[PDB]
Design an enzyme around this catalytic site. Structure first.
Site, mmCIF file in Angstrom:
data_model
loop_
_atom_site.group_PDB
_atom_site.id
_atom_site.type_symbol
_atom_site.label_atom_id
_atom_site.label_comp_id
_atom_site.label_asym_id
_atom_site.label_seq_id
_atom_site.Cartn_x
_atom_site.Cartn_y
_atom_site.Cartn_z
ATOM 1 N N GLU D 49 1.595 5.632 -8.554
ATOM 2 C CA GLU D 49 1.520 5.514 -7.105
ATOM 3 C C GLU D 49 2.940 5.274 -6.616
ATOM 4 O O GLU D 49 3.604 4.346 -7.084
ATOM 5 C CB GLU D 49 0.568 4.386 -6.686
ATOM 6 C CG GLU D 49 0.214 4.429 -5.213
ATOM 7 C CD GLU D 49 -0.660 5.617 -4.866
ATOM 8 O OE1 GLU D 49 -1.317 6.185 -5.777
ATOM 9 O OE2 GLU D 49 -0.681 5.987 -3.676
ATOM 10 N N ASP D 60 1.819 -3.606 3.271
ATOM 11 C CA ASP D 60 2.472 -4.032 2.042
ATOM 12 C C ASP D 60 3.052 -5.392 2.213
ATOM 13 O O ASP D 60 2.577 -6.363 1.635
ATOM 14 C CB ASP D 60 3.614 -3.076 1.675
ATOM 15 C CG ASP D 60 3.125 -1.698 1.275
ATOM 16 O OD1 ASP D 60 2.218 -1.609 0.427
ATOM 17 O OD2 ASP D 60 3.652 -0.700 1.809
ATOM 18 N N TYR D 175 -9.453 3.671 -3.554
ATOM 19 C CA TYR D 175 -8.585 2.496 -3.630
ATOM 20 C C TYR D 175 -9.385 1.258 -3.253
ATOM 21 O O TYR D 175 -9.659 1.020 -2.076
ATOM 22 C CB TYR D 175 -7.358 2.657 -2.724
ATOM 23 C CG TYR D 175 -6.208 1.699 -3.001
ATOM 24 C CD1 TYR D 175 -6.373 0.323 -2.872
ATOM 25 C CD2 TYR D 175 -4.956 2.169 -3.383
ATOM 26 C CE1 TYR D 175 -5.322 -0.562 -3.114
ATOM 27 C CE2 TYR D 175 -3.896 1.288 -3.627
ATOM 28 C CZ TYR D 175 -4.092 -0.073 -3.495
ATOM 29 O OH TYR D 175 -3.062 -0.958 -3.729
#
Ligand code: NA
Ligand code: NA
EC number: 4.2.1.20
Lengths: 255, 395, 395, 255
Positions: D49, D60, D175
């Site tokens: 990834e 993030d 995911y």
């Protein structure tokens, strides 16, 4: 007052105007101020106008506010002013002595007590610069109870009703500050006012002769004197000689 | 002769040099005429409403009073254009100047707030504004100097000797005495010679008139007390005036206690001074034993006036109004409390009024009482002062 | 699925990580419910009227327009509690947070003004307020940091890398994504993901609704144009909204031109940027050729936003509203002009709107036109900025 | 996508989970990043990834925002990222390569053109972190037109309608970021979702074995890898040996 009546009677016999200097008491200091005042008298002052240093003045302004500051810097209290007044009178029994006051100093310890102290030290008149004729009754009454002449200002914006009140309420002298002086004097004579002293911008001999010619009884000079004091703070002796020369010149112009 | 009584009991009057009497008489007659003129009143109302933002809110502060039987409302003069009540009466005085055909305004200022008010009114109404300021006050408040100049006023620093408010006042009056035909002296509080205590009250009385209407609408009854800070007296008399004949309504004025009355560093002449004659008036003042005017002190520059308006001295003397004092630290705590609990940053002046209301609530928390505090100004101007203090004390 | 359309034409949407969708959906449903709830509307009106000071004045500025055929009114959001329009919608969002049972508020700020608004609303309504701020913005505006803390908010400086508004936004949203059950994210303009552009417009639309009623009362007709500054778009859409269906009324939004569009140092993405996807929305933005968000620039911190609300992009695209720009120097001249001629110190943000109105009047002085400028804030906060500039240029 | 299908088929034959590291492209620099990635693959990464540095990130945060900053400090453009991707694919023909993107970089030069470039360089999947399934249609359509798998996040606050959309719209892998993993996996299997990779807080071998035991197809580890890069910025060679040791440990746990 009696001293003013006697003074003006004598000057009228002499075909003469009065010349009246102003200074602040205790400027630049007590002994020097006593020296200044004795010099003014010896040079020919017919009467004195004496200012009591005030925390916050107004009908005066610049040259005089500094004088007030100088006197405060020397630490002059109103009680010390009354002591100087008693001494001046002890040296000079006939010269009329007028005070320029502000109302709070008259009011502070009682109005009647203030004028009683004026009479004790031999003051002849009191002008309270921030008490107009409209507010003057308790001041005038206390003054007269102690044989003190209440002084009033006749300003340039005066009107006929003010002229009649100033003529009726004032004693000693009328403080003259638009009508030509001649007509203002005429109306003041018609209303039987106390003898008028012209007090606006008197700084040269020709103004003294002009005021007497207009029919005034004399002239009061304030800022001019305190300027001579201002100029020579570092030369006490030159200060006195310059003061002598100015006052002698101004008084000569009144004859 | 005057048209109106220059005295409130023994207090007040017109203790000015003779040369200024025609100016005061002219002003009185113009004011009396204006009060009888529906067109003057309509113009004044138009400016107050559509320019200054009246009526101002009456805000209920429920968070402040939680756990007590006090109900507290704030009259929000902080929401007025300019951020303080001073704006009401400068608009009236500026209209009055135009009624007398005058095109210039003279003012003087210390804290700078009255100067900003006079400058904004002069800008709006097309008057040439010159403002005297003690140079020390100049240095102490350079923001407001810039504001005044931004707004087109000429600012004149007065050096005198003490270079302070009293020195600026003296220069403004000397100016006025020679220019009154064309210039109006815009006095900044309900003090000075007649007719100013009367004019300033009447041009501030919409504070109490609105408060009365708003509290009757919201609570159905008049307050148990209305509470206002007292520097010279204008915001307080503006709040009090419409309630004077409502004898059930307490009137409480709050003088600055500074570092504490016993320290001598305060601005509470009404309760701790002595009657004298100064500023054109017979009134309580701070003065030395032989009659020289004393300096006052307050953390709040707006309350740092060593005298008080004569109508307050009169209302005190007959017992119609009560006057108390509040120290710097009490005012600071009230300032913090209002910020935290209501989201309103109050002027440190007004914080003295709030502090006394907080004491009335906290000392007797099961007493039922309906209180109105006049929030005379906003406190953005004070955040730096409050910061430096809290920083200097370890907060 | 949503209850309301998230798009204005092609602009808008909900471009957020999946984890934030439940928070946005919850907010939309609470908002739709609140708009149908008379009790919510009554509480909101109570706060606006009795705490914030609505309605605000509509001021005629005759001095400004002298010698022209322009009539100019200012909608006085500068008179609102807090000194800017931002207060309207934070009170609504804070009530909405309580409707969802939330007791905490998350906000972020750059110029500090939204942070002050969120802190005062949180203090009033009893909410725990935490405010993210780019540390550079922290240093640049330490007054407002003190104001927020005075008002009980927790201020959190964000170091990230660029330590700016976008960095504070990202931290606020990361916080919200894990706390939305108990905390509400108080976005500060009419931008971001749906439903915020819609909610902020509806909680600002009283600006235009009052303006319409006031101008009909005073002039008997609607304006030829209403004019507002555009940073993110809230004060402008609040002014515009009630006029959108009055097709005779021009809608003019003013983006900051900074040092000039041709210098690239500006904040005018609507007319000089490029559509992108950022801040949760598809909207015009300032961005590099390969899609990195660019920094904006304006003398006015409130307009220094590199995007714009999607409803403005839509109104522009269909030609219902026109968007222009105004440089730093034009805004500064308008600031000076209002101070001098009306006695009102305007925010430098709002000065951009005024400057464009002054240009419409000055370029065509015999054109008859009735203009309303939204005076979105007061400019006391800007006097130091204006001082330093005039001092640095020899004034 | 095809590479993902082939990978998961082989791992299922091996009774094995996938281990998938995350790194930012060009962190700390281009050549070192290429070295890092080759080290991750040699140590046993089953897929990659890869993050494209973005001006303003979000899903993030910290450890990764620094990585983005480091890559910007090195001056890495998206065009340089696509060049690195082509090279990685030229070295490694079967390993699935997934990109972590933000929407503006996909939108910037046209969405279809972005996925066309992904296909040209041999990328297998794209996760657009700020495009929720509700907004995903034009992204998914462009992805599938260029044989790119659209990746969706199944978050902890997921609900049944989200599970059905993620299962229906995602390809390659799901995911996974509350229900016990087991039940979430059950529902994802019932709805025929792409094989799930657990991606929350994967930092130790026991979490890899736990995810596979729960029924996930493998685990994605992001912050842990970039921390090893962070720690050894001054020791390029220690950096690679530490990365080798971590990835070898994590992959072993999946067998
Ligand atoms: Na006082
Ligand atoms: Na913008």
């Amino acid at each position: 007052m009696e001293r003013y009546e006697n003074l003006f009677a004598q000057l009228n016999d002499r075909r003469e105007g009065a010349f009246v200097p102003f200074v602040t008491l205790g400027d630049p200091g007590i002994e020097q101020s006593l020296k200044i005042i004795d010099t003014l008298i010896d040079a020919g002052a017919d009467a004195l106008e004496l200012g009591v240093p005030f925390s916050d003045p107004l009908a005066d302004g610049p040259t005089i506010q500094n004088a007030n500051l100088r006197a405060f810097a020397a630490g002059v209290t109103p009680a010390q002013c009354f002591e100087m007044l008693a001494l001046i009178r002890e040296k000079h029994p006939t010269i009329p002595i007028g005070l320029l006051m502000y109302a709070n100093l008259v009011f502070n310890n009682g109005i009647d007590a203030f004028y009683a102290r004026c009479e004790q030290v031999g003051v002849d008149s009191v002008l309270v610069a921030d008490v107009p004729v409209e507010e003057s009754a308790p001041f005038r009454q206390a003054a007269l109870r102690h044989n003190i002449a209440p002084i009033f200002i006749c300003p340039p914006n005066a009107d006929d009703d003010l002229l009649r009140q100033v003529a009726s309420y004032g004693r000693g002298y009328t403080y003259l500050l638009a009508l030509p002086l001649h007509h203002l004097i005429e109306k003041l004579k018609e209303y039987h006012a106390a003898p008028a002293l012209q007090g606006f911008g008197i700084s040269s001999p020709e103004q003294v002769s002009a005021a007497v010619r207009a029919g005034a009884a004399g002239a009061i000079s304030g800022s001019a004197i305190v300027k001579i004091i201002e100029k020579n703070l570092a030369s006490p002796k030159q200060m006195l000689a310059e003061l002598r020369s100015f006052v002698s010149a101004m008084k000569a112009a009144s004859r | 002769t005057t048209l109106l009584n220059p005295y409130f009991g023994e207090f007040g009057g017109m203790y000015v040099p003779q040369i200024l009497m025609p100016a005061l008489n002219q002003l009185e007659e113009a004011f009396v005429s204006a009060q009888k003129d529906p067109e003057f009143q309509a113009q004044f109302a138009d400016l107050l409403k559509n320019y200054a933002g009246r009526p101002t809110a009456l805000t209920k502060c429920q968070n402040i009073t939680a756990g007590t039987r006090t109900t507290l409302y704030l009259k929000r003069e902080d929401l007025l254009h300019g951020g303080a009540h001073k704006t009401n009466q400068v608009l009236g005085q500026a209209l009055l100047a135009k009624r007398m055909g005058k095109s210039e305004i003279i003012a003087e200022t210390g804290a700078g707030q009255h100067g900003v008010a006079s400058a904004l009114a002069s800008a709006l109404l097309g008057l040439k504004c010159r403002i005297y300021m003690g140079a020390k006050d100049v240095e102490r408040q350079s923001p407001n100097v810039f504001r005044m100049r931004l707004m087109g006023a000429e600012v004149i620093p007065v050096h005198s000797g003490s270079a302070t408010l009293k020195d600026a006042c003296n220069e403004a009056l000397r100016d006025w005495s020679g220019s009154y035909e064309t210039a109006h002296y815009m006095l900044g509080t309900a003090a000075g010679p007649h007719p100013y205590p009367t004019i300033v009250r009447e041009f501030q009385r919409m504070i109490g008139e609105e408060t009365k209407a708003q509290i009757l609408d919201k609570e159905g009854r008049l307050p148990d007390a209305v509470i206002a800070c007292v520097g010279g007296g204008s915001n307080a008399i503006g709040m009090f005036a419409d309630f004077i004949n409502d004898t059930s309504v307490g009137l409480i004025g709050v003088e600055p206690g500074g570092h504490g009355i016993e320290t001598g560093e305060h601005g509470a002449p009404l309760k701790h001074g002595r009657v004298g004659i100064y500023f054109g008036m017979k009134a309580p003042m701070m003065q030395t034993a032989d009659g020289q005017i004393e300096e006052s002190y307050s953390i709040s520059a707006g309350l740092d006036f060593p005298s008080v308006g004569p109508q307050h001295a009169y209302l005190n003397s007959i017992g119609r109004a009560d006057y108390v004092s509040i120290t710097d630290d009490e005012a600071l705590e009230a300032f913090k409390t209002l910020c935290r609990h209501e989201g309103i940053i109050p002027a440190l002046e007004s914080s003295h009024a709030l502090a006394h209301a907080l004491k009335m609530m906290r000392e007797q928390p099961e007493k039922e009482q309906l209180l109105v505090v006049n929030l005379s100004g906003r406190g953005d101007k004070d955040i730096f002062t409050v910061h430096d203090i809290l920083k200097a004390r370890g907060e």
